[PDB]
């Protein structure tokens, strides 16, 4: 029935289907390094007639130091990004400083929680890996769900084939990870999740923060990841 | 800020001076008071220059939206019938003396709107501070059904009479013809007599007593 | 009230996508010096004047739109499209960017899915136009998402209609050469072989304002 | 398959059900009648509800209402729902009197009452009205005109019309005599003869005539003119 | 009125205020009043103005910061705290008067000890000294004579003794009692002294 | 109002523009409470706004203008040109028509491979005074117009422009009383910016 | 800015000057003090020309939205003017309403600052220059007249109201109203001597 | 079975709005037709004057309603829905004057009506308006304009169109009647469009309705130039045009 | 409103045995001069009660229309002759209209006098809205009320509003008798308004005398 009604088991229905609706969406990888947080993506290819060179709809920008990698309904994702950009700017307008991500996910999971509680509207079939840098506790990487129960992490692989890709980060991840070593680490889990051995490079997109006291937050071009893809060939950080 | 307006045999010629002010000083020697409502209709207003910005741009896009809704070119009596609906509610808030008019299905009209809300058709008018000086030479040399060249020199003399005989005026004089084909944004009589040329002094480069140089090379 | 489903997909959205899969075919192809769009105008008789019923409307002096669904909805979304091309033009004196415009219409379509007691839009848009960052040709989905296409079709039987574009398209095609590859994707694609001034074609016309090609103008290209 | 539930549901045949049932609702209630005459517009209203109460006052249950001195209104159907339309009728006259300082004409009131009844049909939550309204008047220069408003708008000008539980019966009795040029004082005796055909000798039929050159304003039943009823011929 | 003397050192911030509670133009309701609004996150807000408006704004900004200090386990940054209360003053200006004057002081590891001045209007700015009320016209100058860099925290108490004593001699209303809110090394003592 | 004075002057060289502003924020009219209140802000890497007037709106309009720019800035990968930004200030001030926003902003920055000067003035209501030459607004606009009239060459060098704007501000600030000490000039080239703080008269 | 309304034996006439002075200056010379409403009634207003154009706009909107409510060829006359009074629930402006009617033959009656109770009027006159000819009209006006008698009467009336007034118009306008609705805008230009 | 046509804002699996589809059948079930045709500098609407399926005054029942003095229109379908649509048009066309000064255009009136119609479609506020009509009227360009709107949103516009229960048996006849004047003689325009278009309009109605078409059961209206009034042609002229078939 | 721009003169209401006598001139002065000299002020509000004015005539329509409307609403529910709105009801209602305006600042300057017959022992159970011998009343069935612009309300045996309060009432407080004849009442007002012709600057002739008897509401027009 509607989202307002419960179930005899204690769970819900609309928020339970949304948790499964994101399982049929492309994967995204999160990863905290010793230099800055990095993200992964999977451009689902409906055809070869997309631009494939200027845009990508799996990783967006929230602020100059906060960025998320969305995974789920691409249509409903644009609303929360248009809603998180306001909270990331209304905090600046009210406190003259950057907003900590710990105070951003709370501000954004409440907008999801408010939908699965009243109004009689459908929930948000979206879940994303939102990370950033802050002066209070350094780099961080949070993860929201359609219910709102956010939680901090070090590496997450939501989308399709989560349990397999998350297991890769259980062993291959290390506490100390450089920026270049972290990219190669996140490159293999992004490729083996799609049951392939090498990315076609006209696929997956990556992003990285690495605050150099100014939070550069550079994204990646189709030519910049070629050098990263070539480094995977020689040094294979295999499935295992 | 003398703005003259008249109607020729087939088009309407507007004209004004490019010199705003603050009361005791000159704001700038070049500030085109004319505007662009559409292709076949132009505008020029006097009074406070601040309120004229959100009355021209507001009318430019609202006419453009109505132009895209239908297929024909907009008509001059529609826009004037829209400012009064907003100017009445801002009777002591919005103050402007606007003169506009162009070619349409009817003849080349030229409406003159008052700040309180009054507006009526006029074949020739002058609005601004030195508007009296502009209307003075206008009423003595205004024939009916004049050519474009016959109206070009008239509006040039109408503004030039409002240039010397008035303090709140000056600078160059720009005019515009609003014929059905296209428009013109010409700036004739840009007073090149040059009674006296300046002498700018490029100061030498010793230093300027600077205690801190926090130079940055951001790309 | 268009709720979810146990399979994890909106059922009203999937039903809305079937409506655009059974309407007149719309087709847009970008080029290196402009973007072109086309639509098979199914003329039922000679009573309907062509200058009234159209499938190519304007948003500004540089933005073109194409419809592909419910004809009754061909105006309400247009009114809010032109309104957004004015609200951006009032504050910002320059022209409205296509990416800034398509993200607002996609947000308008989105709000007609989550709101209770409403019906999703029964159409697919094709926004195209000259931009300061090159050319663009976007496609809006009734679900609310948008794609940054290069050459696509959204009308009836597009699974095989796009096949002409997957094999007869190059990255560097001029706008005049792309017209015949678009007409071929309409005449040689399915029925409607009597293409004699029954196709509306809009072009960006190499950075000039949006031009709706007339019937006799298309006749010069309809001879091949 | 049960499509006549709400009012906003259209039947697959094309008809609008849930509003056609109201005609079957007014067909079981008491009837009303009116007709054109060369001297005025005589009205009529039979209250065939004698077999159950028999305790009401003789001249209490009146179903003749007037918005002002020259326009009469009757009901046929749910008497409770018709009170709301009279409230919207008198308020329509008073609103028209404030804005125009004159009596509201007939062809502009009927078009405003029919809009009010039709407006409640379009809603998905408000139930439609269940009362057919007869609106008539009699001009001094022009002759009279009777407008009949049934549920789901349809304002129609008539010359004599009956609505109630015997609309297919009294309609045949009016077409016999040309009432357009007779009188009012004789038609009132003819009206009482019709009721006896189709059910007792009771004074449960209260009715007034708008014009008998009695300043051309809505009068009452005038009991003295009603008591010499030709109860046999 | 009342004086609100504030001085920012390099490793400490001191705040001074009058402990008088002027009711009308004649009587003093109470000596040793409460003008400070201590915050848990090493921030000491100090208001100045009419006792009525000086109270509500002191509490509307104290609980609104303690709420923020609990909605996140962190403490509010001093740079953010000063610009926050400035926004509330600008917000409470087009509707209500709020004739108050404040001195915002705090401490944070990201920028050291800070101090922020304000006005009846929103005139927030980071300074090193400064005062308020009518007493500012006699104490904003003495601070410039004894403001050498690298001041020890014990030096400022001697500056105020060289400043309060001047207020006792050349001011219209000779304020005798004074309250000091020293903020040396994450400790906020209160060395309130007279004369 | 004549309260908490200040001035902002923008110059336009050959391919590099420059701005300058005082720093003496005054409590009352004839008072000095701070000498470190810059009146120029980095709205973008190619847009620099200079505010002048009451401090209750200099900080408020800067927070609003940053919130409106930073929100619009992330909706496109590229930056914000001055053309679309200068028209925004005329809209924010007009939206706040019968509002007390007492500011006289100055918008400078490159118009854009190429680079143009693009200086612009405004009023308290929002009249976009376009000027391809020098620009000024503040409480000391009277002593700056004539000052920047007989000392302004059309096209100047990067370092030569700084000397012109230096004497243009140090002569006007010494002539006015409320716009006190401090002059954080800001010369900027397409690849380098220069933030110099002159040594004005501390009186 | 005088306005004179004289009734006929069958129809009615209106008269007005065209000056609309704006602070001892003529900014809209040869304007229209009189205004059209329909084929059977006109409205000539004076006084404050600020809110004058709005009331003429609202009346024109409420007349078209009312004439189509009856049928295609029937307005009403008294109904429209009392609606103009209700629009004064301020905007200081004196108005004159006159025209032919389907019920009565002709009708002309003023609307003062706030109350339109001047029905069955015969020589309604208002404006600034109306104070100078209130007695001249009371003498030369008989009960019943002809078309040329009233035309020659109001010609001198507007002339005398302009010969001694700073708000004297330029070309005067005279509007007729009859059963057939002649309505010829007879414009006269001669002035007093 | 319980198919997907209960509400109005719920799509079907194939993607068809059945509440709209049933509303069009309501117009086809009222068995009232009307013909509209635009020729050179003129356009006419032919009614039928029939009760939407004794003592009824036939001068009152009609299917022609003037929205303004320049723009007239016809109405068909349910009598309740067609009356409210005129009031939602008269209050809109007159609103255009108060909000824009100029008189409303014929093409803008139909598009503004369809905007309000589309709003009731996406929202489940009210029931659809089971009606249709032919908006007629000349514009400022001195050209006649005709526009037809279905219960859904439509601003088609035709040079000759039929509305009513017989739209599936008239396009084959109106095309021939239009061809009987376009590719035929077409000599000149002597401002005798009434004797040229209305005569070639009433003839179209007689080819649709097999009756004798009594003059006291038909009323037309012209909005041609030199008239500009949406005048209902008198009874004597209607009976005079009926004899021109011989 | 603000300021009595179009004032009025004063009326005089006196009761006697056959009925209520009221009188008023037709001068409607525009402040300093007689603009309108043929206006009516004695307004008929029922078949048994009437009401007069003074003060601004323009602020009387907002009270006349708000009163004649109530009469038609009451007439539409006349199920008995006793359901007619008695003068006690109209006078108390008018006072409520002035009291709610007094709570605001706009008072609608008027000094309304309401007079009528407060009984139902004389058959009038038939109303002729759009158009023999007299009787004797017990002086308690005749209601004459006064209403000030401040909302002051009461009822007495002889009321005089406006400027004649200082002239008419003085001559009428000692010359008034009980059960005056018809010729006695009209000769009392005729000799009374004569005093109001040489002293009041805003007054004239055309005394529209209106009598309310047990048979109707008559009208007369002398000229003194």
XYZ file of C-alpha atoms in Angstrom, chain G residues 21-90:
70
model
C -2.103 70.725 -18.055
C 0.715 69.357 -15.890
C 1.972 72.072 -13.531
C 1.500 75.217 -15.676
C 2.736 73.349 -18.751
C 0.892 71.400 -21.435
C 2.473 67.959 -21.708
C -0.339 66.140 -23.556
C -1.895 68.806 -25.799
C -4.947 67.694 -27.828
C -5.691 64.665 -25.644
C -9.035 62.909 -25.111
C -10.947 64.015 -22.036
C -13.949 62.102 -23.358
C -13.848 58.322 -23.734
C -15.852 55.665 -25.544
C -17.550 52.738 -23.823
C -20.017 51.366 -26.359
C -22.327 52.384 -29.193
C -24.759 53.960 -26.743
C -22.823 55.585 -23.876
C -19.716 57.696 -23.384
C -17.701 58.718 -20.344
C -15.966 62.084 -20.072
C -13.854 62.411 -16.938
C -11.818 65.243 -15.491
C -10.103 66.196 -12.262
C -7.031 64.194 -11.333
C -5.695 62.609 -14.513
C -3.545 60.181 -12.509
C -6.103 57.558 -11.491
C -8.417 58.670 -14.294
C -7.031 56.265 -16.889
C -7.370 53.306 -14.536
C -11.069 53.877 -13.825
C -11.715 54.154 -17.551
C -9.893 50.857 -18.009
C -11.851 49.018 -15.297
C -15.132 50.390 -16.622
C -14.273 49.237 -20.148
C -13.426 45.793 -18.796
C -16.612 45.613 -16.762
C -18.748 46.790 -19.647
C -17.536 44.219 -22.172
C -17.744 41.493 -19.556
C -21.337 42.537 -18.834
C -22.718 43.170 -22.308
C -21.812 39.666 -23.408
C -23.572 38.243 -20.383
C -27.020 39.171 -21.663
C -26.940 38.559 -25.439
C -25.076 40.169 -28.353
C -26.979 43.464 -28.782
C -28.114 44.664 -25.388
C -26.042 46.365 -22.716
C -28.074 48.452 -20.106
C -27.305 52.002 -19.044
C -27.984 52.727 -15.372
C -26.428 49.428 -14.373
C -23.030 50.364 -15.719
C -22.784 53.680 -13.892
C -23.725 52.400 -10.444
C -20.945 49.871 -10.922
C -18.606 52.810 -11.386
C -19.755 54.145 -8.028
C -19.016 50.840 -6.277
C -15.415 51.157 -7.517
C -15.044 54.008 -4.968
C -15.014 51.829 -1.890
C -9.163 57.014 -2.717
